[PDB]
Amino acid sequence: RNEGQWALGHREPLNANEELKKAGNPLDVRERIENIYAKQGFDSIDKTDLRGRFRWWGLYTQREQGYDGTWTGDDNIDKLEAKYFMMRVRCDGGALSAAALRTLGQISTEFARDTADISDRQNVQYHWIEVENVPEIWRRLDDVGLQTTEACGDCPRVVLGSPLAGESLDEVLDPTWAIEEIVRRYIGKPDFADLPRKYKTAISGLQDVAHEINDVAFIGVNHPEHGPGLDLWVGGGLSTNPMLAQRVGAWVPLGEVPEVWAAVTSVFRDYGYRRLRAKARLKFLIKDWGIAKFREVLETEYLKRPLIDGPAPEPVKHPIDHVGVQRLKNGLNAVGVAPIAGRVSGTILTAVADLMARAGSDRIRFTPYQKLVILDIPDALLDDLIAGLDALGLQSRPSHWRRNLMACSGIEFCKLSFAETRVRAQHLVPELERRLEDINSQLDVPITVNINGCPNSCARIQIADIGFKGQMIDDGHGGSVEGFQVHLGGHLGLDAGFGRKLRQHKVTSDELGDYIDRVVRNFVKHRSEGERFAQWVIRAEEDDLR
Ligand code: SRM
Ligand code: SF4
Ligand SMILES: [Cl-]
């Protein structure tokens, strides 16, 4: 019985999305940008290019101005499509030189109305970009060793790596090599250009890459016999049907990582479902097959050998975000700063690149939690840096809230969203800071808040202390507005799991601060000593949670 799987012989398209990939190599659309589209403009762009093949090059069309959630749906595309683009720049590892960061700044100030926002996958995204300047931009990014290749599309998304790869004192190893090997080997190459859906990778020495929710994850663990290598995890995801990735129970050494990554992706290519668009993510295959069959197939058909068994890394009790100052293997310091919901500007990035030059620093990393850290600051030139960054509003000593808050793009730019998230976040933070500085000392433990535009969970709705899922709501049977559902007490690391939903409960855009304030206060009210938020939630009564 057919599910669209290549490996079972069913190579026949069953989607419009699968249909468009059978029409040449999607990535081939780059000639057409430079040759045709950047020269003729938005309206020349064939619609199967604009909506399909543009994705393989980091170009999603942004939402047209002044259409609220009322208008959100597959059937309003012509209306919702603004003649501008969100261009996503691929940063495998968050890793960047100061020259590279510089370029990202000026590209934004110049081409993207100063918009630059750090994604929770270590990328930057621009908005207000026009096709005319795409060729100029590619040309420019190349100078600094950056591309947009497969930053969107049915292909491997950015590979996450630790913001502190190679300098962290706690890391099991530095797997940067493996990342760069994967990118050098495999990005832009025909073999993995066509996958049932998107494909997300995390590789790190630390559990600081939200690994449990990636399609494939490689995580430092000491093997008692074989030494520092990587633990392999597979089948994660969070959209509208969240599933934690699971241990394959294998241990992979650094050098074999890119080989084993290619294996896994290969299994996705061939056995992944291609009938339903909503059922195409690897996770669904893993759910169906079970972990053991997966490993069986993986060894027997693609690696041609068993993967050496190995232990799980010991799950951390607290997420590792790298905000703040820390000593390096260097003998130097690194600096983690927090913007609000990843929101920086073209100006900020350049202004930052310059402060780095002042410090002698040439290494910066973006963070899987929309943050950025500067590396190799010597003690001597550190305070003059921090003050330089605080000046741009990039706080290295942020508050509880500013530090542990994410938002997606939402209805500001995103054509799929029901609510405003990012701008909303720029104001909610000060409101919470001054509203709850009151209770602040009594919180010995952080509260994480993720504001999501719609159910897609781009800012990780399910795995926050307080998670907000943007749905359309009714207001006295007069008219439908924007609003959020709450998911509470979801965490990664030790005993990972998702936040609970509440029965008949909605939070309008205005009420966000009200709800947070209340449930936080009720937390402190009913909590026990040392008890984390998430722990309370599981025993808490419905009423204290509303
Ligand atoms: C920018 C970012 C949010 C952020 O502020 O961090 C983001 C924003 C978008 N995501 Fe994503 N996603 C981002 C991380 C994720 C994550 C989180 C993660 O990877 O940890 C998820 C959840 C995890 C997962 O994938 O399971 C996520 C699940 C989605 C979904 C759900 C897809 C699905 O599997 O069903 C969509 C829609 C889709 O693919 O059909 C999607 C679609 C989008 C689009 C392209 C909306 C669209 O299709 O038109 C958003 C960009 C619109 C815009 O104009 O900004 N994105 N999105 C993140 C981009 C990181 C990157 O560089 O790649
Ligand atoms: S979670 Fe939804 S609204 Fe937010 S950025 Fe993703 S697709 Fe857009
Ligand atoms: Cl995405």
Domain boundaries, the chain: 1-81, 82-151+317-398, 152-316, 399-546
Resolution (A): 2.9
For residue 436, with 0-12 CB atoms within 10 Å meaning exposed, 13-18 middle and 19 or more buried, which class applies? buried
Task: Tell me, using a 6 A CB cutoff, whether residue 258 lines ligand 1.
Answer: no
For ligand 2, what atom is nearest to the CA of residue 414? 8
Instruction: Please give the Cα distance from 286 to 236 (Å, whole number).
Output: 9
Instruction: Please give the Cα distance from 143 to 180 (Å, whole number).
Output: 18
CB 154 within 8 A of CB 195: yes
Looking at the DSSP bridge assignments, the partners of residue 86 are: 60
Instruction: Please give the Cα distance from 4 to 363 (Å, whole number).
Output: 44
Instruction: Please give the Cα distance from 26 to 19 (Å, whole number).
Output: 11
Q: What is the DSSP letter of 37?
A: I
Experimental method: X-ray
How far does the centroid of ligand 1 lie from the alpha carbon of residue 98, in Å? 27
Q: Which of 284, 287, 340, 456 to mutate to test the pocket of ligand 1 (most atoms within 8 A of CB)?
A: 456
How far does the centroid of ligand 3 lie from the alpha carbon of residue 152, in Å? 7
Q: Of all protein residues, whose CA lies closest to atom 1 belonging to ligand 1?
A: 119
3-state secondary structure of 109: helix
Task: Tell me, using a 6 A CB cutoff, whether residue 72 lines ligand 1.
Answer: no
Degrees to nearest 5, angle at CA 467 with 424 and 511:
50
Task: Tell me, using a 6 A CB cutoff, whether residue 281 lines ligand 1.
Answer: yes
Bridge-based pairing of strands 95-96 and 333-337 is unpaired
In 145-226 the beta strands, taken as DSSP E runs, fall at: 156-160, 199-204, 216-223
3-state secondary structure of 447: coil
Q: Is 458 annotated for ligand binding? A: yes
Instruction: Please give the Cα distance from 416 to 455 (Å, whole number).
Output: 10
Q: Of all protein residues, whose CA lies closest to atom 9 belonging to ligand 1?
A: 458
Degrees to nearest 5, angle at CA 59 with 194 and 368:
85
Q: Which CATH class is domain 82-151+317-398?
A: alpha beta
Element at 351 (helix H, strand E): helix 346-359
Closest of 336, 413, 418, 329 to residue 372, by C-alpha: 336
For ligand 1, what atom is nearest to the CA of residue 86? 54
- Across the beta sheet with 124-129, what order do the strands follow? 59-63, 81-89, 124-129, 115-118, 343-345
User: CATH homologous superfamily for 152-316?
Assistant: Sulfite Reductase Hemoprotein, domain 1 (3.30.413.10)
CB 486 within 8 A of CB 502: yes
Among the bound ligands, the one closest to the CA of 120: 1
Q: Is 414 annotated for ligand binding? A: yes
How far does the centroid of ligand 2 lie from the alpha carbon of residue 456, in Å? 6
Task: Tell me, using a 6 A CB cutoff, whether residue 410 lines ligand 2.
Answer: yes
Instruction: Please give the Cα distance from 37 to 45 (Å, whole number).
Output: 6
> Which residues are within 8 A (CB) of 304 and not within 5 positions of it... i.e. 6 or more apart?
none
Instruction: Please give the Cα distance from 287 to 440 (Å, whole number).
Output: 42
How far does the centroid of ligand 3 lie from the alpha carbon of residue 244, in Å? 17
Give yes or no on whether 152-316 and 399-546 have one common fold.
yes
Decide if domain 399-546 falls under CATH 3.40.50.300: no
How far does the centroid of ligand 3 lie from the alpha carbon of residue 199, in Å? 9
For ligand 2, what atom is nearest to the CA of residue 417? 3
Give the pair of three-digit tokens for residue 22: 């059978």
Q: Of all protein residues, whose CA lies closest to atom 2 belonging to ligand 2?
A: 454
Task: Tell me, using a 6 A CB cutoff, whether residue 417 lines ligand 2.
Answer: yes
Degrees to nearest 5, angle at CA 426 with 318 and 148:
75
Supply the angle between the helices 422-436 and 512-526 in degrees, to the nearest 10: 40
CB 19 within 8 A of CB 13: yes
Looking at the DSSP bridge assignments, the partners of residue 467 are: 450, 487
DSSP3 helix / strand / coil % (the chain, rounded to 5)? 40, 20, 40
Give the pair of three-digit tokens for residue 505: 């409960």
Task: Tell me, using a 6 A CB cutoff, whether residue 96 lines ligand 2.
Answer: no
Element at 19 (helix H, strand E): helix 16-21
Q: Is 155 annotated for ligand binding? A: no
Count Cα atoms within 13 angstroms, Cβ side, for 399: 20
Q: Which of 71, 152, 423, 456 to mutate to test the pocket of ligand 2 (most atoms within 8 A of CB)?
A: 456
How far does the centroid of ligand 3 lie from the alpha carbon of residue 341, in Å? 16
Q: Is 454 annotated for ligand binding? A: yes
How far does the centroid of ligand 2 lie from the alpha carbon of residue 417, in Å? 5
Count Cα atoms within 13 angstroms, Cβ side, for 415: 21
CB 5 within 8 A of CB 271: yes
Instruction: Please give the Cα distance from 123 to 94 (Å, whole number).
Output: 7
Q: Of all protein residues, whose CA lies closest to atom 7 belonging to ligand 1?
A: 458
Closest of 113, 126, 55 to residue 85, by C-alpha: 126
Size of the chain, expressed as the number of residues it contains = 546
How far does the centroid of ligand 3 lie from the alpha carbon of residue 52, in Å? 14
Task: Tell me, using a 6 A CB cutoff, whether residue 458 lines ligand 1.
Answer: yes
How far does the centroid of ligand 2 lie from the alpha carbon of residue 104, in Å? 23
For residue 96, with 0-12 CB atoms within 10 Å meaning exposed, 13-18 middle and 19 or more buried, which class applies? buried
Instruction: Please give the Cα distance from 298 to 292 (Å, whole number).
Output: 10
Q: Of all protein residues, whose CA lies closest to atom 1 belonging to ligand 2?
A: 458
Task: Tell me, using a 6 A CB cutoff, whether residue 119 lines ligand 2.
Answer: no
Q: Of all protein residues, whose CA lies closest to atom 36 belonging to ligand 1?
A: 456
